Design a protein around this ligand. Structure first.
Ligand SMILES: [Zn+2]
Ligand SMILES: [Zn+2]
Ligand SMILES: [Zn+2]
Ligand SMILES: [Zn+2]
Lengths: 676, 1287
RNA sequence: GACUUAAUGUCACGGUACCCAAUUUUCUGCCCCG
RNA sequence: GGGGCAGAAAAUUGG
């Protein structure tokens, strides 16, 4: 009969899709062709359709719902649409009774796996009680062939998560080889209350993840199991979080200079649980001080490993163009490895040490922990060789920062009083950076901020007192996006000074009349090809232009030069002659990074691309100031290349916040973004 | 302590939502999105009626925002009493949160009151908020409220029963469009309500403190928006008709089904819908087209008997029965009912199910836990705030389209649906947005989306709009768009839209794909709409000035406002005109603003207002920056789209068919040209006369097909997730097109007299030699000539970002159009729509000019056939022959199944053109049947027909259809092909007497004959194109002395062929094709001219003009993808050699129209190899092609005993080629001294023109006592056999 | 004044019904015996 | 003794 030929053709196509040898594009073409022929058969035989055809429609919709990649930091509605249509389709299948026993149990198992995936992807629509009733009826029918299908094993593990006791089914669950070690540990913990085999099989699972890519399902289910173990106050999550952190670190080791990582949602909560585990173990009493210092150093290492990369999206990965033909190849092997891992899960200079700092320096790391809603500052002192940490809260500081941001973006120069309020709130919320025990008096401080604290002025903090003293009046401050950007070997050794300039509305004609810029590379009316011709390590490069910020891709933030400007990727590729070069940028940071609407942000400016190239330091502005201030900075740097920036900020009137807030606004806007 | 009765009036369509109290609101998504709308509650049971209202909390929120803004303007004062900032936070420890939370910024100021507000005394702001009151957050008695807002109920003007939802509201789908790809992401629904009848609401406000009355009455005049519409707040002191039409449509469908004509019903439906464009007089004065003269049947379909009467009188009775619903609704309802009954009787209700395309998404209006923020904004003390208002008009420079969902889905109550359920579609596939009074509409959301798109382009950066939000976005685009207010537009025009059809082509076979017809409603061009914009802020932006200067038009510059949803086809480009900008200062003229209410709803008066009639406080704005000084212009907006404008010269007839307008217009014609309806603005009518045009879809498809054939991307089976060149330039499912096309308009249509030409065509049977039954038709194209060409001006826009290779592809497509590879319109294989030249305007960019500029013998066959020596080479002038003979091949046909495709230019195949000349050996008659009167002579004698020679604009021509039919008959007789045109009828039928292999090729499964492979069939386009022939040189006008015109001939009576003579005696079979003989039988007709104008009736014969011998005509044959043997057989069929010629025209039994075709030039081009101009193809390779064709014919015969070599072929070795070449042999060409005598018998002696003792009658030649039947059939199968002594 | 709001906090003017497709393919205004 | 044919067959929505 021709209907059976069409059905076996559709099943042949679906089993061609099931084989782990096809590419994702071939999978998309095969399953949507099978769905086309099945929907045509539906349109022909609309009410005289058999039940098994509707079952095949639901199975084809499940296979379609597998191969939809998540774009953005949310669940796409195409996946929910496919899941809800396959639920509706299998509902009118199971209301069409009197098939065989195999057809009935197959319909119940398809409905079970659809409800499981739809409950995982959406909570408010599909509650846990409906899942409990549906899976209880499905196991009342008897889908218990644990030696044939893994879907029954998934039903079993989900029911033990819900609470329906299956100690009668325990021997069949353990003896099955298709169930991997994570389901075995979950079965041993959830039913038998035996913890030792659970620890063994969890150790095997975390050992297995060290070669598995991040887009796999096992990462998501492992971190979810760790969070569930944390929620009932067990004693095994403290080891499992550290093991999964070590596995994720050794897996993320395998990337290159294009610092990317796959965006999956439970990355941050894994790092937060690992931080809380090491923090609690450091808070536990230990008579040996070296263990405690090592645990605080491990906290700093966790923070550094989080801050290292910046977690690009998926549509930005597909959207961005191709250049230099080898970074394209590394990007393409990363992308296709990640997508084939995602579908394969469902189808079946040298980096410095944390204590390698110069003498007389104090290093301060930050970590905003979203689970406890706290913020931790970790301090390393080299002269005493000691590690300490302290805590604070970050809600009211976020409110005052958003107030300053709104007032600035409406009235740029006239938000000076909100700037003073923000500096006083930094001084009130974080009082430990004025105490002598936490940070010694007269030492240079390096800040490594991680959150919206990248945008906060830390050097201009005001002490919570009557006659308040600024932070920069006794300390020299430096900044860095992450510790992995720090490098050695400055070695300027040259005396060439280069200028580039594109905008003529700013009055820099007195500056272009100068005599220091006597080399051939200095020109007005710059371009990108004129930027990539810098020959051999100038001592000071000055770029005077505007900035444009792509609000999704940090790779597309551009400096407004002629012939289309130069982007982040072109600075990473084309520019080669800038090793050991101090750079003074005229464009503000607010034009180079987009304004933020969440507590978390990870968007890197062109200054860190200059740091990845090899530059010695970048001195820039946090917000928009007058052109005369940048002119005075460039002149003071040209006459004096050895002097520090905090003396210039103190001398020009950076301590006049109580009487004239415009001078305090124009003074503290300048920031050095490079470590010696 | 006095009440205030308040009325709010809406000046725009507002938004409605269903009412749920507080928890069922959280159950629903539309209710959570639908806050700050107007609310609808049901009354009674059954979900049909109810009432609508507006809550008092919404009016309280609007009044509080207005008070805060007015206090922010005057630095925290109002009329001398200072105010504090107030409170907007609630501690969660004491009390509950007040059921609505604020996410926007709160304006604040310095509080200089030098007092803290207590319960005993407070400022006007604190007593207007209700801080120190006795009532809060739990309702009690309606006293102990210091200020109380009641609900606002709909002021129904006339008291009736309970109001229905379908009388007030109507549903609509809105959209969200991505910026990088140009495609929608998600959608959501809403209810829009009428403001003309149902836009007045009345409420009460009670105030128990005469200290904040002035601030409240001032703030009531500062509220500008409510429920999605502009507002003004003032203080006072037919089921039965559908059932009847369904019954009568059932009557019409059964009356059609009795005649076996059901498939016309579909066509009839469309025709009735087209009758909405005319008036009622087309059914009342009977202006529907009448049929041909003296015909018992009338029209094609307007004269089918329905229960005894004609269809037009039935439609008259139906219109008299249903005069109370208007003409438009009557036509639309009759068309829809006929379409529904046709779909029911056919069997398919067109289910319309879509896999994974819905994505209905509502923004999550609930606050996820956390993020309760308070953001104060403090303006500087000095700063000035102003409001700018821009008034003007929008004009459609192209036909526009604003999409809307189909009816029976835009019902507000019954939106309940399921994923599984299928959706019944309606008559029109794509509808247009209209008002309740059938007026055209530009909605607010489309204008706001286009302004957001152009502002993001002008800034160079922006955010994709996020829906679930806790913090307001601070990107530049959003900051400027939170200060812009618009207004919806309706025209003063209420005429029906125009239907435009679209198809899609199969690239392999070059015919129409299955299931690709659809129809779109478009609006007229030239329509005008009002335009109002408002901006409230501190300074006027430069980017907004750049966008406004971009949208407007002037001298030289044209407007660039793309609104709507068919932009790739060029639909929806508007221009902005009559722009006036006015300025209102708010720090000193706030009382005048409050008193005049901001001129909300009176902006129509501002357009005609003079300078001296303006109200107080409103000044003209003078510092509006010019176009050359705007820096966001000329850097971001001007290089975005670039224009290429060109002009095509067509030197042939041009036909883009309509086929429904031909049904509903007088003339009784089959295919007419395409016309447009253009609206005029000086006079408010449309226009008196239409404008002829070529569609934008057509030449968009021409460009796409040219690029796809040159690159090779048309051959791919699927284009899902594709990065090919064709999908990059011309878009796909995931990306919009990078190129936009507009129409080609005729620009020289007034230099013609009789712009349209009437050309009629017929099909000739291969056996009988006459016209086939129901195979006569007419065409009505535009009259283009080689010396009077048609000129069409067109335009297309290109985007910034194109590489050099894609510009090379576009330039190569333009060069392929210029060389003539892609003809415009229909019937291109018979010479219609052939492009003769191209021209490019001087404002085209320079690189395109350089790319288009840089891209710019006596051949004889010498073969002599040995003719039949027994008829004329033995006896010179004593024999009589028969004027037609029969050629009989065998039965077998070679059918090929690997059919050559049209989807690429293959490497081994050949393509090019042949220039040929045609010489007349006998007089030639080609009539012009457009004018039956012709010269004269109809008035003197009734009856008699007289024609002229075929001409377009006074130039004698031969049509390409005649040449194609003659060459097709010759090729099919040469290559032993099937009988292409055949008929089955009375004496069993003569379709059964034919062999089954000689039946016409139907379908591509069994294969195609060589004639159907070269010249084409219904489901396969051919690979040869014949053009119109032009007169060149020689004499003209054969002169007979005594005749009423000098260049003329009155021919003999000529009537239909009788197959009873050719096949009597039932055990007999069809003896093949019919051919005519070459002789000078026209001299008998010429000398016997007086005996023809008497002794026979003038109704029988025809008078015509003739051409003499020696005339030369020139024409062209184009070809693509030809094998070498097919080209060889074609070149042999064109020039078969010396003393062999063809037959063309009228009077072939009498000896008229012997033509000799001599090949002048052959050109072949190969575009797969890199580039060069077209070659010359010398004599050696074309002789090699003729040898390959001869070897293919030898291989097809089967007798392989004849050797192979480079010897000149003797064609008469094969039998049927010898019979054919004896039939087409001219015995008077080489200055020979013989002429035959070929004429018909006399039929029953003592009759017309019987020679004395010849015995040449049908009595003595059909009576079986001499020449029995087998000898008679054998006498017609041997060419040139004598009949008067009968061999 | 019930249906029909809660009051120290409503950016829904926070969202273009959008993207893709040649009204086309085949046809001599022709012509004799009961 | 005498005029015929005057349109026929598909596609009417799908991604
Ligand atoms: Zn107050
Ligand atoms: Zn925005
Ligand atoms: Zn493609
Ligand atoms: Zn054929």
């Amino acid at each position: 009969t021709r209907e059976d030929i069409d059905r076996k053709e559709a099943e042949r196509l679906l089993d061609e899709a099931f084989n782990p040898r096809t590419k994702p594009v071939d999978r998309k073409k095969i399953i949507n062709s099978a769905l086309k022929i099945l929907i045509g058969l539906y349109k022909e035989k609309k009410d005289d359709l058999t039940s098994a055809s509707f079952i095949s429609i639901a199975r084809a919709y499940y296979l379609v719902s597998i191969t939809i990649l998540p774009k953005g930091t949310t669940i796409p509605e195409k996946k929910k649409e496919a899941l809800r249509k396959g639920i509706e389709f299998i509902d009118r299948a199971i209301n069409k009774f009197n098939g065989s026993i195999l057809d009935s149990q197959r319909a119940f198992r398809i409905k079970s796996v659809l409800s499981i995936e739809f409950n995982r992807i959406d909570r408010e629509k599909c509650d846990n009680i409906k899942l409990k009733n549906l899976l209880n009826e499905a196991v009342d029918k008897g889908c218990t062939d644990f030696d044939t299908y893994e879907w029954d094993i998934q039903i079993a593990i989900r029911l033990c998560e819900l609470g329906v006791d299956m100690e009668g089914h325990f021997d069949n669950l353990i003896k099955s080889n298709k169930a991997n070690d994570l389901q075995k540990a979950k079965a041993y913990y959830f039913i038998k209350k035996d913890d030792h085999k659970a620890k063994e099989h969890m150790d095997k699972c975390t050992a297995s993840l060290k070669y598995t890519p991040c887009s796999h399902r096992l990462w998501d289910e492992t971190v979810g199991f760790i969070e569930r173990l944390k929620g009932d106050s067990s004693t095994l999550w403290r080891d499992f979080a550290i093991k999964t952190y070590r596995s994720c670190r050794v897996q993320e080791k395998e990337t290159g200079t294009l610092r990317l990582r796959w965006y999956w949602s439970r990355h941050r909560v894994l790092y937060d649980m690992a931080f809380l585990a090491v923090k609690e173990q450091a808070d536990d009493e230990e008579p040996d001080v070296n263990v405690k210092q090592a645990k605080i150093k491990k906290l700093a290492e966790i923070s550094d490993s989080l801050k290292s990369r910046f977690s690009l999206r998926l549509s930005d990965m597909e959207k961005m163009p191709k250049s230099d033909d080898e970074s394209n190849h590394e990007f393409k092997k990363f992308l296709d490895k990640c997508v084939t891992a995602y579908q394969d899960g469902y189808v079946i200079a040298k980096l410095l040490e944390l204590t390698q700092v110069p003498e007389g320096w104090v290093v301060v790391h930050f970590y905003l922990n979203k689970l406890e809603g706290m913020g931790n500052a970790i301090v390393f002192d080299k002269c005493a060789n000691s590690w300490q940490y302290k805590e604070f809260q970050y809600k009211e500081l976020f409110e005052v920062f958003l107030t300053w941001q709104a007032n600035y973006n409406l009235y740029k120069e006239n938000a000076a009083e909100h700037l003073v309020t923000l500096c006083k709130k930094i001084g009130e919320t974080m009082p430990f950076l004025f105490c002598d025990n936490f940070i010694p008096n007269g030492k240079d401080v390096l800040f490594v901020p991680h959150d919206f604290l990248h945008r906060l002025p830390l050097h201009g903090s005001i002490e919570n007192k009557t006659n308040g003293k600024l932070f920069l009046e006794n300390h020299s401050c430096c900044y860095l996006p992450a510790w992995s950007f720090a490098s050695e070997k400055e070695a300027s050794t040259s005396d060439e000074y280069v200028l580039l300039k594109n905008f003529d509305q700013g009055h820099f004609e007195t500056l272009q009349n100068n005599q220091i810029w006597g080399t051939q590379s200095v020109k007005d009316g710059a371009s990108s090809d004129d930027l990539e011709n810098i020959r051999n390590n100038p001592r000071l490069l000055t770029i005077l232009c505007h900035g444009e910020a792509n609000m999704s891709n940090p790779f597309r933030s551009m400096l407004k030069l002629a012939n289309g400007g130069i982007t982040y990727l072109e600075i990473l590729n084309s520019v080669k002659g800038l090793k050991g070069s101090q750079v003074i940028l005229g464009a503000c940071e607010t034009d180079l990074v987009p304004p933020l609407s969440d507590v978390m942000d990870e968007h890197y400016s062109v200054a860190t691309a200059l740091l990845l190239i090899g530059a010695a330091g970048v001195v820039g502005t946090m917000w928009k100031v007058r052109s005369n201030k940048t002119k005075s900075l460039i002149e003071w740097k040209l006459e004096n290349i050895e002097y520090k920036l905090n003396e210039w900020q103190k001398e020009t009137g950076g301590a006049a916040y109580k009487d004239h807030p415009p001078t305090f606004y124009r003074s503290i806007a300048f920031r050095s973004i490079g470590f010696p | 302590d006095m009440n205030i009765t308040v009325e709010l009036t809406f000046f725009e369509p507002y938004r409605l939502v269903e009412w749920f109290d507080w928890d069922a609101r959280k159950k629903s998504h539309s209710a959570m999105r639908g806050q700050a709308f107007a609310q609808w509650t049901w009354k009674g049971k059954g979900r049909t009626a109810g009432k609508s209202f507006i809550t008092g909390t919404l009016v309280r929120s609007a009044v509080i925002k207005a008070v805060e803004e007015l206090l922010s303007l005057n630095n925290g004062k109002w009329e001398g009493v200072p105010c504090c900032n107030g409170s907007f936070q609630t501690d969660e420890s004491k009390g509950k949160k007040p059921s609505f939370l604020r996410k926007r910024h709160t304006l604040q100021w310095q509080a200089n009151n030098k007092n803290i507000c207590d319960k005993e005394e407070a400022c006007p702001f604190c007593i207007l908020l209700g801080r120190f009151d006795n009532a809060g957050k739990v309702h009690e008695r309606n006293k102990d409220y210091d200020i109380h807002f009641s609900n606002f109920d709909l002021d129904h003007k006339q008291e009736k029963n309970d109001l229905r939802l379908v009388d007030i509201a109507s549903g609509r789908i809105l959209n969200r469009v991505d910026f990088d790809t140009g495609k929608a992401k998600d959608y959501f629904r809403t209810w829009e309500a009428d403001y003309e009848t149902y836009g007045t609401y009345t409420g009460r406000i009670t105030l128990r403190n005469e200290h904040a009355k002035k601030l409240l009455l001032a703030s009531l005049g500062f509220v500008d928006k409510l429920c999605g519409a502009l507002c003004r707040i003032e203080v006072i002191k037919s089921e039965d008709h559908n059932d009847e039409l369904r019954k009568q449509a059932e009557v019409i469908v059964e009356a059609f089904k009795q005649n076996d004509k059901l498939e016309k019903i579909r066509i009839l439906a469309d025709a009735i819908r087209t009758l909405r464009l005319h008036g009622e007089g087309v059914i009342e004065k009977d202006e529907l087209p009448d049929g041909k003269e003296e015909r018992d049947k009338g029209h094609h379909l307007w004269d089918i008997k329905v229960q005894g009467t004609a269809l037009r009188t039935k439609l008259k009775e139906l219109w008299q029965s249903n005069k109370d619903i208007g003409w438009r609704k009557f036509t639309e309802m009759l068309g829809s009912n006929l379409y529904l009954i046709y779909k029911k009787e056919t069997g398919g209700v067109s289910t319309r199910f879509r896999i994974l395309g819905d994505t209905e998404y509502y923004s999550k209006a609930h606050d996820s836990e956390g993020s309760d923020l308070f953001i104060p904004v403090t303006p500087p003390e000095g700063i000035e705030t102003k409001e700018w208002i821009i008034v003007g008009r929008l004009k459609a420079a192209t036909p526009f389209y604003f999409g809307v969902q189909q009816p029976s889905d835009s019902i507000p109550g019954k939106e309940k649906k399921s994923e599984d359920s299928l959706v019944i579609n309606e008559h029109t596939s794509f509808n247009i947005l209209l008002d309740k009074e059938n007026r055209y509409r530009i909605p607010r959301s489309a204008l706001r989306g286009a302004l957001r798109r152009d502002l993001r382009t002008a800034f160079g950066s922006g955010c994709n709009v996020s829906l679930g939000g806790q913090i307001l976005c601070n990107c530049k685009v959003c900051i400027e768009m939170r200060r812009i207010t618009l207004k919806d537009s309706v025209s003063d025009f209420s005429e029906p839209p125009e239907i435009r059809y679209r198809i899609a082509k199969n690239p392999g076979t070059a015919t129409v794909e299955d299931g690709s017809l659809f129809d779109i409603e478009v609006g007229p061009e030239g329509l005008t709409f009002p335009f109002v914009l408002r901006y409230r802020g501190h300074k006027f932006p430069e980017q907004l000035s750049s966008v406004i200067r971009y949208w407007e038009e002037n001298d030289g510059k044209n407007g660039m406002a793309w609104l709507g949803g068919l932009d790739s086809t060029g639909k929806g480009r508007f221009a902005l005109k009559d722009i006036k900008i006015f300025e209102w200062d708010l720090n000193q003229k706030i009382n005048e603003y409050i008193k005049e209410r901001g001129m909300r709803g009176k902006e129509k008066e501002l357009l005609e207002m003079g300078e001296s009639s303006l109200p107080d406080g409103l000044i003209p704005y003078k510092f509006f920056e010019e176009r050359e000084c705007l820096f966001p212009y000329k850097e971001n907006l001007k290089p975005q789209w670039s224009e290429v404008q060109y002009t095509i010269e067509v030197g042939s007839p041009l036909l883009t068919a309509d086929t429904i307008s031909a049904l509903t217009e007088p003339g009784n014609r089959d295919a007419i040209a395409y016309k447009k309806r253009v609206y005029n603005d000086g006079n408010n009518a449309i226009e008196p006369e239409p404008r002829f045009a070529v569609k934008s879809e057509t030449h968009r498809g021409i460009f796409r097909t040219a690029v796809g054939r040159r690159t090779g991307d048309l051959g791919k089976e699927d284009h899902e997730d594709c990065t090919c060149d064709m999908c990059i330039i011309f878009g796909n499912e995931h990306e919009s097109s990078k190129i936009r096309f507009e129409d080609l308009e005729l620009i020289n249509g007034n230099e013609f007299e009789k712009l349209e030409k009437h050309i009629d065509h017929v099909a000739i049977d291969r056996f009988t030699g006459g016209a086939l039954d129901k195979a006569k038709f007419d065409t009505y194209p535009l009259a283009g000539s080689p010396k009077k060409p048609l000129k069409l001006k067109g335009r297309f826009w290109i985007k910034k970002g194109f590489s050099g290779d894609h510009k090379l592809l576009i330039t190569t497509a333009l060069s392929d159009i210029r060389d003539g590879l892609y003809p415009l319109g229909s019937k291109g294989g018979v010479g219609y729509g052939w492009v003769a030249g191209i021209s490019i305007d001087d404002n085209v960019p320079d690189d395109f000019k350089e790319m288009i500029n840089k891209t710019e013998g006596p051949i004889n066959n010498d073969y002599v056939h040995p003719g039949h020596q027994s008829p004329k080479q033995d006896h010179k002038n004593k024999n009589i022959y028969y004027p037609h003979y029969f050629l009989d091949s065998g039965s077998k046909v070679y059918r090929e199944k690997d059919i050559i495709t049209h989807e690429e230019f293959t490497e081994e195949l050949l393509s090019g053109k042949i220039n040929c000349k045609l010489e007349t050996l006998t007089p030639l008659i080609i009539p012009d049947t457009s004018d039956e009167n012709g010269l004269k002579l109809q008035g003197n004698k009734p009856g008699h027909k007289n024609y002229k020679f075929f001409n377009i604009n006074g130039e004698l021509m031969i049509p390409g259809s005649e040449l194609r039919g003659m060459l097709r008959t010759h090729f099919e007789a040469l290559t032993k092909s099937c009988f292409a045109i055949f008929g089955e009828d009375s004496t069993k039928t003569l379709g059964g007497k034919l062999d089954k292999a000689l039946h016409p090729c139907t379908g591509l499964s069994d294969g195609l004959c060589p004639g159907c492979h070269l010249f084409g069939t219904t489901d396969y386009k051919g690979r040869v194109k014949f053009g119109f022939a032009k007169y060149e040189n020689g004499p003209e006008w054969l002169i007979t002395r005594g005749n009423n015109p000098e260049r003329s001939l009155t021919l003999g009576v000529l009537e239909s062929p009788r197959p009873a003579f050719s096949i009597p005696d039932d055990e007999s079979e069809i003896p093949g094709r019919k051919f005519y003989l070459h002789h000078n039988g026209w001299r008998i007709i010429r000398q016997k001219q007086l005996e023809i104008r008497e002794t026979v009736q003038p109704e029988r014969n025809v008078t015509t003009e003739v051409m003499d011998k020696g005339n030369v005509f020139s024409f062209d044959v184009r070809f693509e993808n030809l094998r070498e043997w097919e080209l060889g057989l074609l070149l042999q069929s064109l020039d078969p050699g010396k003393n062999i010629a063809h037959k063309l025209g009228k009077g072939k039994p009498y000896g008229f129209g012997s033509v000799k075709i001599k090949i002048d030039s052959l050109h072949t081009f190969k575009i797969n190899s890199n580039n060069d101009k077209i070659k010359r193809v010398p004599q050696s390779d074309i002789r090699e092609y003729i040898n390959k064709g001869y070897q293919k014919l030898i291989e097809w015969s089967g007798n392989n005993s004849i050797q192979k070599g480079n010897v000149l072929p003797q064609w008469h070795v094969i039998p049927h080629i010898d019979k054919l070449y004896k039939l087409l042999w001219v015995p008077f060409l080489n200055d020979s001294k013989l002429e035959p005598d070929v004429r018909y018998p006399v039929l029953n002696e003592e009759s017309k023109g019987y020679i004395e003792g010849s015995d040449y009658t049908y009595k003595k030649l059909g009576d079986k006592d001499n020449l029995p039947y087998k000898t008679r059939v054998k006498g017609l199968t041997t060419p040139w056999s004598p009949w008067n002594p009968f061999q």
